[PDB]
Design an enzyme around this catalytic site. Sequence first.
Site, mmCIF file in Angstrom:
data_model
loop_
_atom_site.group_PDB
_atom_site.id
_atom_site.type_symbol
_atom_site.label_atom_id
_atom_site.label_comp_id
_atom_site.label_asym_id
_atom_site.label_seq_id
_atom_site.Cartn_x
_atom_site.Cartn_y
_atom_site.Cartn_z
ATOM 1 N N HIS A 72 62.010 95.897 74.277
ATOM 2 C CA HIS A 72 63.413 95.484 74.480
ATOM 3 C C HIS A 72 64.263 96.483 75.312
ATOM 4 O O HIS A 72 65.369 96.916 74.884
ATOM 5 C CB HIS A 72 64.086 95.189 73.121
ATOM 6 C CG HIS A 72 63.458 94.058 72.367
ATOM 7 N ND1 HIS A 72 62.442 94.249 71.450
ATOM 8 C CD2 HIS A 72 63.712 92.721 72.375
ATOM 9 C CE1 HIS A 72 62.093 93.084 70.934
ATOM 10 N NE2 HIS A 72 62.855 92.143 71.463
ATOM 11 N N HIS A 76 62.920 93.598 80.170
ATOM 12 C CA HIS A 76 62.941 92.334 79.444
ATOM 13 C C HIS A 76 64.230 91.539 79.775
ATOM 14 O O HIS A 76 64.160 90.334 80.031
ATOM 15 C CB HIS A 76 62.826 92.552 77.938
ATOM 16 C CG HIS A 76 63.037 91.308 77.118
ATOM 17 N ND1 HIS A 76 62.143 90.266 77.102
ATOM 18 C CD2 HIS A 76 64.039 90.955 76.279
ATOM 19 C CE1 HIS A 76 62.604 89.304 76.314
ATOM 20 N NE2 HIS A 76 63.747 89.705 75.785
ATOM 21 N N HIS A 112 71.689 89.658 76.660
ATOM 22 C CA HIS A 112 71.199 89.119 75.400
ATOM 23 C C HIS A 112 70.484 90.052 74.414
ATOM 24 O O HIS A 112 70.405 89.690 73.241
ATOM 25 C CB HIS A 112 70.422 87.814 75.603
ATOM 26 C CG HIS A 112 68.966 88.025 75.628
ATOM 27 N ND1 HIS A 112 68.316 88.511 76.735
ATOM 28 C CD2 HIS A 112 68.040 87.900 74.659
ATOM 29 C CE1 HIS A 112 67.028 88.644 76.446
ATOM 30 N NE2 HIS A 112 66.842 88.273 75.197
ATOM 31 N N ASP A 113 69.954 91.199 74.839
ATOM 32 C CA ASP A 113 69.328 92.158 73.900
ATOM 33 C C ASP A 113 69.889 93.582 74.142
ATOM 34 O O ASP A 113 69.192 94.584 73.809
ATOM 35 C CB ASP A 113 67.794 92.273 74.062
ATOM 36 C CG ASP A 113 67.001 91.249 73.281
ATOM 37 O OD1 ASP A 113 67.422 90.856 72.157
ATOM 38 O OD2 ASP A 113 65.908 90.777 73.756
ATOM 39 N N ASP A 230 63.450 83.511 76.783
ATOM 40 C CA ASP A 230 63.088 84.594 75.877
ATOM 41 C C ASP A 230 61.649 84.515 75.441
ATOM 42 O O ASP A 230 61.029 85.541 75.280
ATOM 43 C CB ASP A 230 63.953 84.559 74.619
ATOM 44 C CG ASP A 230 64.141 85.928 74.000
ATOM 45 O OD1 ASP A 230 64.570 85.996 72.837
ATOM 46 O OD2 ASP A 230 63.955 86.974 74.618
ATOM 47 N N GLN A 281 48.500 86.830 69.066
ATOM 48 C CA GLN A 281 49.026 86.115 70.229
ATOM 49 C C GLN A 281 48.636 84.643 70.132
ATOM 50 O O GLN A 281 49.443 83.769 70.433
ATOM 51 C CB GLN A 281 48.551 86.727 71.573
ATOM 52 C CG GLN A 281 49.324 87.965 72.038
ATOM 53 C CD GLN A 281 50.850 87.782 72.037
ATOM 54 O OE1 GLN A 281 51.359 86.822 72.615
ATOM 55 N NE2 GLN A 281 51.567 88.699 71.399
ATOM 56 N N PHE A 284 50.930 83.127 67.689
ATOM 57 C CA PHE A 284 52.243 83.036 68.300
ATOM 58 C C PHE A 284 52.319 81.834 69.252
ATOM 59 O O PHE A 284 53.338 81.129 69.289
ATOM 60 C CB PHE A 284 52.522 84.353 69.037
ATOM 61 C CG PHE A 284 53.878 84.443 69.684
ATOM 62 C CD1 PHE A 284 55.028 84.109 68.989
ATOM 63 C CD2 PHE A 284 54.008 84.911 70.983
ATOM 64 C CE1 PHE A 284 56.277 84.240 69.588
ATOM 65 C CE2 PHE A 284 55.274 85.034 71.579
ATOM 66 C CZ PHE A 284 56.384 84.696 70.888
#
Length: 323
Positions: A72, A76, A112-113, A230, A281, A284
Amino acid sequence: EDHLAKELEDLNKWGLNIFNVAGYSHNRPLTCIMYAIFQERDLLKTFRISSDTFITYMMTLEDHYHSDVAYHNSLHAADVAQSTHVLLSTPALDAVFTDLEILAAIFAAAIHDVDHPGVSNQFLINTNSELALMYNDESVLENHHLAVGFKLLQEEHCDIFMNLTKKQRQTLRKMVIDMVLATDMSKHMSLLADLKTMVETKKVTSSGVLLLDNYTDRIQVLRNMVHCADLSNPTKSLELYRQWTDRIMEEFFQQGDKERERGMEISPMCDKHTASVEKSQVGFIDYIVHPLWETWADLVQPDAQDILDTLEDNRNWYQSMIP
Ligand SMILES: COc1ccc([C@H]2CNC(=O)C2)cc1OC1CCCC1
Ligand SMILES: [Mg+2]
Ligand SMILES: [Zn+2]
């Protein structure tokens, strides 16, 4: 230098390589891409945003992402902004959004982050951090990123929205808050269910262009669009995806080490001694990413079929690395 300009020729494509742009911009990927995106879309002219003012804000915002956090960091944010810029041009969404909605979505992606500490909302809540006390355990990080981003706009030498009307600034603020709060993963299932209901009753013009009546429907698509951006790492080329996987695992395992140091229960996908990078992954993709993009693909078909093909190919590669 000449390498930066060659890479940026792919500004409007999914195959753009943000790591390369980072290397050639003094590790200011976010400032770089946000400036390329705004010029491409003529946003500086449309909203009479000064270049100096825009650069100073972006550089300050970027310096507010932490360079020692593995995933982050500003790369990103730059990636999510570039991805949102491409999704906004999807043929199915042509002429559907106002210029203010386009500006809002891209701005939301960038901030956003911001100021992410490299630990999850849950970690901040169990360790009684000051952030969780401040925000009463609700979308802790997300409320925070919004707060920093909008805080930096309060200073003349940095208000990129000073030439919008009060009415326009209000509408943008509402839209941005909405979009960044939607990146909170604990809202994922809710958001997906709602997107599935929107597809069910999808209406298109005679030429296959979505029909979005009210503000309600437009911001619901925008919300979901930023959320797909995202969660877009697995839809990019395998080469890009693997570097993103490496970064998120580094970050998650650093959190696991802090959990152990303190005698807290270790979050299982943050435990470096047991967690399979590959299985995680595949999980995910099967349970979160694929279900989401399959639905996004429905909304804008056939615009995202290649994105889905890449995803399914990447899913099979991680699967094949598992014994
Ligand atoms: C490249 O992978 C990932 C990319 C992005 C995320 C976001 C959602 N959670 C985060 O903190 C950011 C998670 C990933 O993988 C995690 C879930 C599966 C294993 C790690
Ligand atoms: Mg986030
Ligand atoms: Zn993010």
